Amino acid sequence: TLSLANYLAADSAAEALRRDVRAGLTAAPKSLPPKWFYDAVGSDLFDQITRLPEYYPTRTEAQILRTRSAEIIAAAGADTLVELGSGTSEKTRMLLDAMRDAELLRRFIPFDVDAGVLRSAGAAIGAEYPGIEIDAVCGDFEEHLGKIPHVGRRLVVFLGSTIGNLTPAPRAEFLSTLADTLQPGDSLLLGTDLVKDTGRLVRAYDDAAGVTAAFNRNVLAVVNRELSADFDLDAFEHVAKWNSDEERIEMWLRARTAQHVRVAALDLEVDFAAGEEMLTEVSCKFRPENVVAELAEAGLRQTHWWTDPAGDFGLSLAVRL
Ligand SMILES: Nc1ncnc2c1ncn2[C@@H]1O[C@H](CSCC[C@H](N)C(=O)O)[C@@H](O)[C@H]1O
Ligand SMILES: N[C@@H](Cc1c[nH]c[nH+]1)C(=O)O
């Protein structure tokens, strides 16, 4: 009853991954793709982040899920739960319980770039819900959504405001593509962190424990290990900023001094100037009405909207137009 499909394993997929890292490192303003945070070490660092006092999103969303999962399941009526950027799927157990309770649960399809997190969560869920079929998919949710099985009536969930780690142009492409993988009867549950006080927003990405910093820097450890690079992690400092124009948090890594870095697997040497900054992640924060309009543009209609009392975070349920 357990399966794993691995689409990131192909050299065709590897080439695209490496091409995107190369483009980031060779652009006039440097960047790295957010997906490279998530090797085994990074997946655990994010798990640490979810427990920080500063990082309100996980517990806020979990509280909405704890109190609204029945409602969500009743509206979706799905027998199949698809989770994008699933990670450890800890919040997802609330959804799985509610589907099981409703006597609908037949299948769980976790989808992640990290196959380790898939094998762990997959084996766990497989045991916690005997008789369920598990179809783990290792892929890039910007490239491999078409590989998610079309079986049954599906609730696709994208929690944790991961959607905000895409800038508006690829975000629109992603949502349009996602919409086009949905069949009649399918649903999207989307978590979106909302615009709020920016002290709160910036602190959630710049905790006093240094955890987010370590998580940010680890992207250099991943590149170092996997692409034969020689970034000096000590040479770069974590920077979190509020971009008010784009209404998004931005994580940067800034060079303390001039750095000269080879990435051997890419046949690539790059340099940083003193004080030069590299963009490692964006975290877009949303206004409620813009979420409605973004879904609509993609060909999706918001049918349900749930928020916490303080309006820190929203969950949307959407169907095809
Ligand atoms: N491009 C991509 N394709 C597939 N998975 C991705 C991805 N970019 C990041 N991820 C995965 O998506 C998750 C984002 S962190 C979110 C974890 C969990 N869903 C939660 O809400 O807490 C991580 O597990 C990461 O490994
Ligand atoms: N998806 C998470 C990833 C993250 C947490 N902290 C830093 N990055 C977010 O945008 O909030």
Q: What is the resolution of this structure in A?
A: 2.0
Distances (CA, A) of 201 to 54, 56, 69, 248: 9, 9, 26, 9
d(CA 61, CA 303): 18
Count the alpha carbons within 13 Å of 262 in the hemisphere toward its beta carbon. Answer: 4
Half-sphere CA count of 59, side-chain side, radius 13 A: 10
Distance, CA of 72 to CA of 68 (rounded, Å): 6
Instruction: List the Cα angle 247/248/251 in 5-degree steps.
Output: 155
The one-letter amino acid code at 252 reads W
Q: Determine contact, residues 108/96, Cβ cutoff 8 Å.
A: yes
- Please name which of 53, 132, 34 lies closest in space to residue 89, comparing C-alpha atoms: 132
CA of 89 from ligand 2 middle (Å) equals: 15
Q: Which of 64, 109, 162 to mutate to test the pocket of ligand 1 (most atoms within 8 A of CB)?
A: 162
The 8 Å CB, 24+ separation contacts for 286-295 are 286/164, 286/192, 286/193, 286/194, 286/195, 286/247, 286/314, 287/194, 287/195, 287/247, 288/194, 288/314, 291/190, 291/192, 291/316, 294/171, 294/172, 294/175, 295/175, 295/188, 295/190
Give Cα 289 to chain centroid, integer Å.
Answer: 22
Q: How many A from CA of 264 to the centre of ligand 1?
A: 27
Ligand 2 centroid – CA 185 distance (Å): 31
d(CA 83, CA 199): 31
Which spans in the chain are helix H? 11-26, 40-49, 56-76, 92-101, 115-128, 168-181, 198-203, 211-227, 288-297
DSSP 225: H
Nearest CA to ligand 1 atom 25: 85
Which among 248, 253, 244 is positioned nearest to 282, based on CA atoms?
248
Q: Domains of the chain by range and CATH?
A: 1-10+56-196+286-321 (3.40.50.150), 11-55+197-285 (no CATH)
Question: If you take atom 13 of ligand 1, which residue's CA is the nearest one?
Answer: 85
Q: Residue 28 corresponds to which tokens in the numbers above?
A: 């006039």
